[PDB]
Design a binder for this molecule. Structure first.
Ligand SMILES: [K+]
Ligand SMILES: [K+]
Lengths: 355, 355, 355, 355
């Protein structure tokens, strides 16, 4: 709610082209298709092949910044991103070689930050997941077995065994309801009453396990990144030790591209920013372009008013941001700083129009 | 649990009439329907047309309070709320012009506060949603592909391609279970075991992403609105800086209409209120009508008793409210204020019956 | 995890008998049923009728404690619990009068505490629910309409209208998957990709709205009840103001019936209790029966050991309970109290066997 | 996200063999199966029988550490793990005796820690679950009844009774959507609009009840275990009382097996560890093998750098772990300790290469 995400967060053309790349698959996969456009997109594989292949050797020129680097992840696919189609091209002379369009699917995941964040936590909590997944397997066959007890007699053809029943378990437990083969008797129909009751508590926990400390990591992700951009601010010599842990949970950083709008004038004042690197376009008769290491919005927050300036991203600014309460929290937290921000609430009145 | 929501929170007749307005659609949509009531409701479009159109020009008289205003949102539909039916009326001479009853559907959303609240946060967290939505597309085709591997042989007519399989993926992943086309082999049936396991963790996160800091915004929504109605209370010169952040998370404000009941006498005392604007009906031999900037309930909370007065909303009172713990928290937080509330617990014993 | 719930929490025979009472319905509801047991259970209605009717007039003798009472809720059904069957008995001379076995269903809800707790909060947060429920109706018809656009042509018989499509919306949105009528074209099949994506975020919020501050109320429910049983403890003259808010969130009270086990000897020490009313059976050569206002378990917690006594509920004891951390929190919170609990960890060594 | 789970957390071969053990069931369960491998796995039951039976008497030699022990849980199945197959072997002379492969299913649960953790909390919160489960039964028949009102007329064969309707309730309420028998009329089709709306709020709460304070227990599980491994650290004479409660929520302990990697050199520094028991392989010219009661990583965290040593688990080390913020929290929390860790950030520069 308090952040300006811009500059094409889904930027890298490596990440982009699997999507157009892999829809190229389908038309090959289909009868009654002319050959015209059939192979026309086979090029587009060759394009994406050649395109990543173009990118490829530039990467293999890894004498760049070659001091200490851990790039087994980033490289893992780039190798295979061209080889797997290639060996596929020949031995699988038949068109099915395109079935090695399973391959680029990691390329989005190549430069997918927030995926390490995902896999980071599973290697702390899977202890639970196992004891639950076991427990999932407990309750599965514990309950799956209860059906073969019954309808083997009059429904062999659907329930003539155990695993045919295990099928109808998790379909029944995991919230799904396919609807292919269903009981006819009473007591077997009774048993479902605990099933959804169970599974929705099972996943009531188990999916909750994920979001539980995932969010801890994500809410932690906004600190590990943001104990940086702290010392850069020239004011933070005075802040006490414990004060920051309160703060950085709320302070998110993002980056705006050049030209874009930051705060348009006259819009309702609802937040303030801490610039740390880049520069701005504070639209005044004399533009007060504050570069790395500044802020604005206090003129509107202390007064509770619209914007005092059409600030626009003159350059690519690594931004921060902040809503009132957390700034009121700061204003509440210390008279030492409200003094200068009060002065600033008068200086920037006289500094906005002036130089 | 601690608030009195009254005065028709779904008030504005602009917001109201799409519901009766759009059910007017259906009878046109249906064969074997007489023409009698068919067009009878076509009027009701004309009514709602004329009705908003009546409202319309009053809005276009936007010389009202014309100083600095940002009304592109509120106006966006009012323009189209009449034009789109209108141009539809002529070029679509055929009855299908009523299919521009897709149009009013924003009119509820026109004056839908809590919808900006919704859209506010997506422009902070969609970073995740993308990396997840990509990941959703990863796991989709990653898994969808695994089926065409198999049943293309014996189920062409259902699984004779890739996208027919992508269909059966999210139907299978997204908790649904349609039940149109289902495997017959083993290993393809095996694969589902991870699917629901996955998707319920996927949405185990992804839907959780929404409620995660949505609630932060909503729990923030009760501060940004309620750092107001703070200075109005004549007592709050003494409160310390940090004290309020604890409080305002709990203090919700609402507004009661005139005439309505606030606290009926003899009901079990469970909460107290801070009036800030309006007036009351404190039912005593001399009604102690406390207007803007007062409170009551302490007589019942400190004593832990039923109500001392049938207080009723004499006027439209912008209300606050408060449960005990948070007032006990305050009573715990300072002896400075319990003194006067103790005195008040004796003054209002003598002030209730007296003037 | 830290509480002993006993004494038949589903106690009241008023609450009990709807369950046996209403299963009495079914056998009447069924063809090919002999008349023998048919009416045999009609008695059981008459029993439950007579039984509550027996209870009834005792309630209508409401001169008991008749000072100030708010009993419209408790009485609302007891009136109807006998009348509705009664008038049903005659005018509905046909057996369908038993269809006024819809009636007792509130009787469990009559003496269902935790149901007021439910309905308490909806009158604070339904503001959201409306803006969401509207939004649910937005996204419903916003999306439902998109289908009649298409398959009216080739699927009139299933999609020959709007509301037939609204049907397939929430079935599709609300996680369900019935599986009666399904598209055949592409673009209409495309649209589902956002649907489950939506609804699982919708209810991703909306159901979350419930558990959100429900839990606040429930976690509040353990304070409003438990600022009581505080002064009774003879030790709590010294505790500081803010200290308790930390505590009472964790301290749950329950009540054990006479005879039952409290802590059996030799079991692993994992918790301690604060008795406030009732008496115990501390199994020692001289039973140290501590009555209202005492505690035990510190001998095992400070030492981290099994139990020092087979304590059993000699009477109906209104119990508290407590795990270590929260007691370590207290031991951490003050040296003033660990002294006496250290002494107690030696006194009760000498007081256990002795008198 | 901050922990190294290793040494075969799913270790015990007792726990292992039900999985291979119980899949042995299926081939017996199936027609058209040769007898060759049929009984070949009957051995594997005899193996697992004999194998646990081998383990068994070693357990029944419970003179080991025979002072005070509470082993009714661990023993409960080991008794039956061999008897139930055994008596099954004879009286059920027919092959169905293998249906006492329902029996080992507790054997995973035998040595399933985190299962007591599960069952611990249900005996605090089931108060709710009942009032909800009742409420589930309320809303069930409250709503189930509403259908027999209607389609008994034209759908006897599907809705010719009450319980046939109760079937279609929870299938409809519990998020499932089987799709066997569906209405045809309007008002009965209307009713579903509240159903999913309800059940997803029902389980919106009810499943949430589980994860609610489950997580409290789990987040508590990391304290009850970890107030241990506290005094062992020679430094913790100075820490203040309240300081630890902040900490131990974050500090998880796990155990690494011998040989395994702990921190490989040059990897990005992201965490530090507290060793308390075992020994390490700090790969330096003179290996600084710190045994029970030490730490490392500060050299990389204060500097924010890659690893200073390929530390590997020389022995089975009962590990702790810690990320930066929580260490920054400590560094923020006191100058008393950053001094020595600063010194350590120079000592271990000179102590790493040296002895
Ligand atoms: K479903
Ligand atoms: K289905």
């Amino acid at each position: 709610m308090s952040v300006l995400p811009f500059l094409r967060i889904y930027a890298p053309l490596n990440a982009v082209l699997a999507a157009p790349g892999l829809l190229a698959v389908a038309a090959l996969t289909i009868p009654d298709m002319s050959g015209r456009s059939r192979l026309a997109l086979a090029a587009l594989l060759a394009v994406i092949w050649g395109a990543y292949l173009l990118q490829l050797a530039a990467t293999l020129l890894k004498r760049r910044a070659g001091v200490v680097r851990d790039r087994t992840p980033k490289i893992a696919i780039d190798v295979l991103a061209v080889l797997v189609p290639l060996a596929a091209f020949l031995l699988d002379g038949s068109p099915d070689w395109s079935l090695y369009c399973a391959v680029w699917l990691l390329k989005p995941l190549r430069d997918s930050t927030f995926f390490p964040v995902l896999g980071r936590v599973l290697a702390n909590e899977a202890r639970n997941l196992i004891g639950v997944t076991t427990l999932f397997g407990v309750v599965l066959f514990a309950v799956a077995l209860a059906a073969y007890v019954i309808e083997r007699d009059i429904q062999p053809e659907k329930f003539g065994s155990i695993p045919q029943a295990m099928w109808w378990a998790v379909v029944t437990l995991s919230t799904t309801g396919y609807g292919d083969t269903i009981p006819q008797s009473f007591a077997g129909r009774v048993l479902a009453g605990a099933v959804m009751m169970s599974g929705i508590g099972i996943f009531g926990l188990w999916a909750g396990i994920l979001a539980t400390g995932f969010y801890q990591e994500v809410r932690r992700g906004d600190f590990v990144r943001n104990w940086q951009l702290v010392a850069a601010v020239p004011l933070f010599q005075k802040l006490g030790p414990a004060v920051l842990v309160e703060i950085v949970r709320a302070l998110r950083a993002r980056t705006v591209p050049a030209g874009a709008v930051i705060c348009r004038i006259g819009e309702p004042g609802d937040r303030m920013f801490f610039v740390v690197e880049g520069s701005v376009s504070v639209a005044t008769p004399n533009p007060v372009e504050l570069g790395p290491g500044a802020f604005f919005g206090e003129m509107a927050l202390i007064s509770g008013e619209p914007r005092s300036a059409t600030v626009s991203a003159a350059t690519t600014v690594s931004l921060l941001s902040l809503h009132s309460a957390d700034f009121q929290m700061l204003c509440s937290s210390s008279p030492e700083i409200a003094e200068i921000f009060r002065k600033t609430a008068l200086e920037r009145r006289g500094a906005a129009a002036s130089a």
